[PDB]
From Swiss-Prot, chain B:
The keyword Lyase does not apply. It is found in: Nucleus. It comes from Saccharomyces cerevisiae (strain ATCC 204508 / S288c) (Baker's yeast). Keywords: ATP-binding, Chromatin regulator, DNA damage, DNA repair, Kinase, Meiosis, Nucleotide-binding, Nucleus, Serine/threonine-protein kinase, Transferase. It comes from the Eukaryota. Changing residue 213 to G: In MEC1-101; impairs both the G1/S and intra-S damage checkpoints but not the G2/M damage checkpoint. This is Serine/threonine-protein kinase MEC1. Belongs to the PI3/PI4-kinase family. ATM subfamily. The gene is MEC1. The keyword Transmembrane does not apply. The chain holds residues 2 to 632 of 2368 of the full protein.
UniProtKB/Swiss-Prot annotation, chain C:
The chain holds residues 215 to 321 of 747 of the full protein. The lineage of its organism: Eukaryota, Fungi, Dikarya, Ascomycota, Saccharomycotina. It comes from the Eukaryota. This is DNA damage checkpoint protein LCD1. Present with 606 molecules/cell in log phase SD medium. It is found in: Cytoplasm; Nucleus. Transmembrane segments: none annotated. Forms a complex with the serine/threonine kinase MEC1 which activates checkpoint signaling upon genotoxic stresses. The MEC1-LCD1 complex is recruited by the single-strand-binding protein complex RPA to DNA lesions in order to initiate the DNA repair by homologous recombination, after the MRX-complex and TEL1 are displaced. Required for the recruitment of MEC1 to DNA lesions, the activation of CHK1 and RAD53 kinases and phosphorylation of RAD9 in response to DNA damage. Required for cell growth and meiotic recombination. Forms a complex with MEC1. Phosphorylated by MEC1 in a cell cycle dependent manner and in response to DNA damage.
Length: 558, 615, 107
């Protein structure tokens, strides 16, 4: 009777999750380093704090620090289950980072590896990390960054008599760059594991102090008057993405919104506007050039970081060469600063452009989110998302048409995705938020709005493509890199791309065609033509009179 | 066969309700909705057992529905008032065809790309009221499948319900593990760019839940193993398409934690002997693809630590590794490559038969399955295996113009090659002789080569550079800030005097007596190549006095006022190149020539690029 | 071990072997100046993932045996690692006596 059911396993090995977590801590290794993180902390002592102790976490004066970490780990594996083992490790390593940090004489070499270790502790099982531990860890990392106040506050230009006669040493600068970058990466990690918790419990994380501390550190990261560290700009805007994305996806959204003032957003969005108007150019990413106009990714902080692999990791060998690896020490191993740099490839510049274009996609994506949060009018959905976004759309169509077509870079498609995205940031601002699009603000960008819509409606002529034979000749000219990409995807990495049955490559010779149309800046997609049509031609606001509009239509045909 | 003409008339019936003109989208609810009767007719003609197995009358059946929903975005959000819009009715109905086509990787990739189009590129028209009614619908239909996955632990569940629950969860996780271009910001957990979303931790939660189910149950059905391979297929698809995918090198990864997750997940899948099935390539594809992403890059330690291989070895048996002949073969190739790059250079020799470096074999053979030669017709496997075995060779590395001459004159670098004078004469004999009229495509490839070789000619007297390590141009490809015409040199060498590739370009193309009919694409190609020449070399004098527009500026006249906008805005890009010279423009007469040319276009369609061409 | 300040692995973190320039038996590499207990804990973490207990035991037994062996038969090298590796080997043997297969005991 009912011999159908799936039979259980009588000897289920539910794996010991705290043992897996112990092992993932013990063989945690940051990319490019020779030793493991615990095996670097076995080579570190702290010789000014004569006796560290918080809660049976004694470190002696000359003892290895990672000796005490692995003693804590073994001692608290036996005792605590996973959700208590996590926050025990978080508060103990936090207190150690704290009193190594607030000290006048002591070197801070243990701090980057303890922050990376703390990040490995947080993100291991995101369901197991209770969010009061996340709250305390978030507040600790924010005031840890305000301890390292000066790393994100180097001035733009130095003295003319700033003589570079100095030992030119990089090891302390490398340490506090690692501290700041791993700290911002840990803030992103805290908020994305908090994003994974059930959606009724976000108020256990958020209070006044969370948002004040992130307001300080966000004004610190997306700087105006100091040299930008791009590593922290990525993470500092991804935090704002996680914030808007959970304001959209929680039920009691009022408590976050009533907890946030208007000044928080109108200090955030102006720095996002100042970030969206910066330039992304391959030939001078890694250059040091004019300030606050080129997102540029400095040579002196080029490593991966804890989440995403952002440069080519040129400073990853120096993390391993920051310690002597056969010795127990406190001061750093000497890294010369001008030995790095040695000319082979500008492909590195192309992929750093790829990251910076995804950064601008991120910025106008959180614009797209907080249109949807503040669907009703406020201080912040206030018409300057016509000004800055239409300036952006118009210039990234203009120098696309003037500069990028036929330049065999991988980053063209994404760069003509940005415009294709930000039109929609125009469009739902036009259709669904016209009540705040003030008449004085629309005429600040009446040039650029109308011209940017015109460069979409020019594609309805379409005397270019119309067939298949010369379009593939065009994509030999503009889009050979994506032919290499799709052949490498077809021969290695895609399950659908073998034994192609003459219906799956007739979709390829539809979508490569519409891709190379959308790159060649004639024949965009029909839907974006409609969205650009129903802004200019629609009578919600008179952009053009009827005798000024057909002066634009005669410059296509019509 | 019977209704291929029926679908071919139905696509004409859909296109017949276009408009009075060729411009038609109709994003609003028109006050005549009869084609929803066709919409109901479409998906109901799809869940049936007889002739859906034919490829064409399924692909056209779903292509007709995509062409219906593309040119009618109001059909999605039309609010079939139960409580919601009808795209929620579209998703769960669209799931049933994909779960009925679980095994064919064509029929679910092709469905999910157009399901990507129906929400990314189609519910940008609606936003807030209609983004949060499908990104909550996916969360509810995913909560349902992960909820019903946990009542098989208590054992009172069914068996076919267990089967289709696994397959439906597979399809829901398959949709969201595509690249970012499939589902854009249409769904609120796939929202973030920079390769790291809310779905990532949720996916790593659900795959651990389904591995916990695989541990908690115990079954040896054959097709249960078949659907159990698709989760490691899905987890290798999760990581193989978050890669940045550069030019021809390995597609570099964005997040090391996802690689650690996938390696640990399929190593846990192999440890418990899950998913063993005869002549199935899936696990072999996963191992070879993920080792291909970790050949010699920063993630090789991440591969060897999290996918440990040296504890299944057992050299003494013909059944060489434990699992299955394809999986044992792929794992043996991975083991061979790891052992090769472990050993020093002197401990390995070159084969001169299979063209692979190899160590001293064994007391036994143990070298058959690594180079047997490769397997049954599983077309991606043997090329994965060729890449794994041949990436060690350290030969002439792949380069873009070397590719596009090897794609064009195949097998060219079996000679000197890197010497520069011979490729000009090879291009010359292929550009003077071997076309009668047939190469309206090959000449465009030849002129993109003449564009790129023109830069490479300019890098001598820029005497150290070479053909092989020239990836892209430092002037025409990478670009900097500021005025872009400060970068090009006034006293650069003249084009006719020194650049022999402009001699080639004028000899074939610009002196051909039928310029006003090449094709539009060959005109665009000759304009790109002439842009690269005149950016790297000084253009010739535009007028001596005897009329005489000099066959290249004449092409600017021909294309600058042409009918298509592409040739217009492409030919406006070389009007500035004529304005920059010395001993042709030192006393400002080319500037005056371009001025009195730009003062002479009183035609309405040329108004765009003219304003560009002035500026 | 009773009376010692450090743990046995934590003593082997403080030991190097500077006459054997490169020890290696079966992916159990020790460098020249590296800590020995670094390599023990690397072997332990690497073979926890892979091997079940009855194979983890004799893997540890033969690897630590080969290390004790070539530290022992050497003219110039100090043998300080050997007592702690023998005590560690004893801890490996007697942990689960049912799990230690007796061919490992014979060897
Ligand atoms: Zn060039």
């Amino acid at each position: 009777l009912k011999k159908n059911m799936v039979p259980l396993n009588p000897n289920r090995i539910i794996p010991d999750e705290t043992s897996l977590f112990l092992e993932s801590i013990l063989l945690h290794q940051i990319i490019g380093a020779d030793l493991s993180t615990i095996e670097i902390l076995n080579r570190l002592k702290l010789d000014y704090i004569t006796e560290f102790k918080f809660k049976n976490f004694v470190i002696a004066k000359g003892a290895p620090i990672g000796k005490s970490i692995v003693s804590l780990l073994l001692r608290c594996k036996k005792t605590l289950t996973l959700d208590r083992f996590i926050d025990t490790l978080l508060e103990d390593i936090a207190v150690l980072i704290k009193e190594i940090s607030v000290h006048p004489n002591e070197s801070k070499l243990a701090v980057p590896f303890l922050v990376a270790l703390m990040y490995q502790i947080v993100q291991f099982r995101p369901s197991a990390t209770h969010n009061l531990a996340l709250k305390d860890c978030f507040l600790f990392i924010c005031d840890l960054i305000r301890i390292y106040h000066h790393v994100l506050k180097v001035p733009i230009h130095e003295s003319n008599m700033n003589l570079h006669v100095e030992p030119q040493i990089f090891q302390y600068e490398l340490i506090d760059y690692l501290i700041i970058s791993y700290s911002f990466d840990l803030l992103e990690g805290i908020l994305r594991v908090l994003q994974s918790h059930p959606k009724q419990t976000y108020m256990e994380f958020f209070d006044e102090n969370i948002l004040k501390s992130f307001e300080f550190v966000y004004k610190l990261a997306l700087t105006i008057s100091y040299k930008p560290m791009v590593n922290v700009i990525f993470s500092a805007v991804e935090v704002v993405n996680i914030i808007t994305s959970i304001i959209l996806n929680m039920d009691n959204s009022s408590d976050l919104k009533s907890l946030i003032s208007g000044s928080w957003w109108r200090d955030c969005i102006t720095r996002l506007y100042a970030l969206l108007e910066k330039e992304i150019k391959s030939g001078d990413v890694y250059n040091e050039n004019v300030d606050t106009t080129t997102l540029h990714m400095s040579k002196y902080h080029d490593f991966f970081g804890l989440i995403r692999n952002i440069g080519d990791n040129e400073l990853g060998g120096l993390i391993s060469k920051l310690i002597y690896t056969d010795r127990l020490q406190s001061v750093p191993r000497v890294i010369s600063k001008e030995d790095i740099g040695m000319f082979t490839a500008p492909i590195i510049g192309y992929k750093m452009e790829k990251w910076l274009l995804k950064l601008k996609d991120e910025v106008l994506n959180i614009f797209e989110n907080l249109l949807m949060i503040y669907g009703d009018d406020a201080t912040i959905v206030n018409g300057e998302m016509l000004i800055h976004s239409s300036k952006f759309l118009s210039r990234e169509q203009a120098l696309m048409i003037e500069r990028y077509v036929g330049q065999d870079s991988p980053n063209l498609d994404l760069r003509c995705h940005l415009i294709e995205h930000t039109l929609t940031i125009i469009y739902r601002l036009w259709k669904d938020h016209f009540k705040q699009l003030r008449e004085e603000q629309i005429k600040q960008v009446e040039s650029q709005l109308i011209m940017s819509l015109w460069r979409f409606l020019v594609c309805q002529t379409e005397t270019v493509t119309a067939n298949e034979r010369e379009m593939r000749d065009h994509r030999h000219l503009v889009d050979s890199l994506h032919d290499l990409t799709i052949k490498d995807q077809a021969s290695y990495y895609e399950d659908a791309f073998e034994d192609l049955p003459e219906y799956i490559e007739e979709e390829l010779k539809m979508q490569l065609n519409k891709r190379t149309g959308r790159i060649m800046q004639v024949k965009y997609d029909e839907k974006f033509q409609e969205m650009a049509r129903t802004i200019l031609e629609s009578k919600s606001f008179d952009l053009t009179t009827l005798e000024e509009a057909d002066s634009l239509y005669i410059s296509m045909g019509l | 066969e019977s209704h291929v003409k029926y679908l071919d008339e139905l696509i004409l019936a859909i296109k017949d309700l276009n408009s009075g003109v060729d411009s038609k989208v109709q994003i609003k609810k028109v006050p005549s909705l009869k084609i929803l009767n066709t919409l109901i007719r479409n998906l109901k003609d799809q869940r049936r057992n007889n002739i859906m197995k034919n490829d064409t009358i399924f692909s056209k059946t779903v292509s007709a529905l995509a062409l219906l929903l593309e040119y009618n975005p109001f059909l999605l959000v039309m609010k079939d008032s139960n409580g919601n819009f009808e795209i929620q009715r579209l998703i769960d109905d669209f799931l049933n065809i994909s779960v009925l086509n679980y095994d064919n990787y064509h029929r679910i990739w092709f469905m999910r790309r157009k399901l990507g189009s129906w929400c990314k590129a189609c519910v940008e028209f609606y936003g807030k009221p209609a983004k949060f009614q499908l990104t909550a619908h996916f969360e509810n239909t995913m909560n349902l499948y992960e909820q019903a996955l946990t009542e098989v632990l208590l054992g009172k569940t069914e068996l076919l319900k267990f089967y289709d629950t696994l397959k439906g969860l597979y399809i829901l996780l398959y949709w969201f593990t595509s690249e970012y271009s499939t589902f854009g910001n249409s769904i609120a957990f796939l929202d973030s760019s920079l390769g790291f979303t809310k779905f990532d931790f949720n996916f790593q939660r659900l795959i651990r839940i389904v591995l916990y189910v695989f541990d908690s149950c115990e079954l040896a059905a054959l097709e249960y193993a078949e659907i159990q391979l698709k989760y490691i297929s899905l987890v290798v698809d999760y990581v193989c398409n978050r890669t940045i995918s550069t030019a021809l090198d390995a597609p570099a990864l964005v997040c090391c934690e996802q690689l650690k997750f996938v390696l640990t997940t399929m190593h846990h899948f192999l440890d418990n002997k899950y998913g063993l099935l005869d002549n199935d390539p899936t696990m072999a594809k996963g191992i070879l693809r993920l080792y291909s992403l970790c050949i010699s890059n920063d993630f090789s330690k991440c591969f060897v630590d999290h996918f440990p291989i040296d504890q299944w070895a057992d050299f003494s048996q013909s059944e060489h590794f434990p699992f299955t002949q394809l999986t044992n073969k792929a794992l043996s190739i991975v083991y061979f490559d790891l052992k090769r790059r472990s050993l020093p250079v002197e401990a390995l020799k070159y084969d001169n038969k299979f063209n692979i470096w190899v160590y001293q074999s064994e007391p036994d053979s143990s070298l058959k399955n690594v180079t047997s030669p490769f397997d049954d017709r599983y077309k991606q496997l043997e090329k994965l295996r060729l890449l794994v075995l041949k990436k060690f060779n350290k030969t002439e590395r792949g380069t873009l113009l070397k590719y596009r001459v090897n794609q064009l004159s195949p097998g060219f670098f079996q000679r000197a090659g890197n010497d520069f004078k011979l490729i000009l004469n090879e291009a010359s004999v292929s550009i003077q002789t071997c076309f009668k009229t047939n190469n309206i495509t090959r000449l465009t490839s030849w002129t993109v080569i003449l564009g790129r070789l023109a830069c490479l000619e300019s890098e001598k007297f820029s005497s150290t550079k070479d053909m092989d390590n020239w990836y892209v141009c430092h002037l025409c490809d990478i670009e900097k800030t500021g005025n872009p015409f400060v970068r090009i040199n006034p006293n650069r060498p003249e084009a006719a005097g020194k650049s022999e590739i402009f001699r080639i370009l004028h000899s074939n193309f610009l002196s051909h007596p039928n310029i006003d009919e090449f094709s539009e694409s060959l005109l665009s190609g000759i304009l790109f190549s002439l842009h690269r020449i005149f950016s790297h070399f000084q253009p010739p004098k535009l007028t001596d006095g005897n009329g005489q527009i000099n066959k290249s500026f004449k092409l600017v006249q021909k294309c600058f006022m042409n009918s298509n906008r592409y040739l217009r805005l492409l030919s406006t890009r070389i009007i500035p190149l004529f304005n920059i010279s010395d001993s042709h423009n030192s006393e400002d007469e080319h500037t005056a020539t371009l001025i009195k040319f730009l003062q002479s276009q009183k035609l309405p369609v040329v108004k765009e690029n003219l304003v560009i061409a002035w500026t």
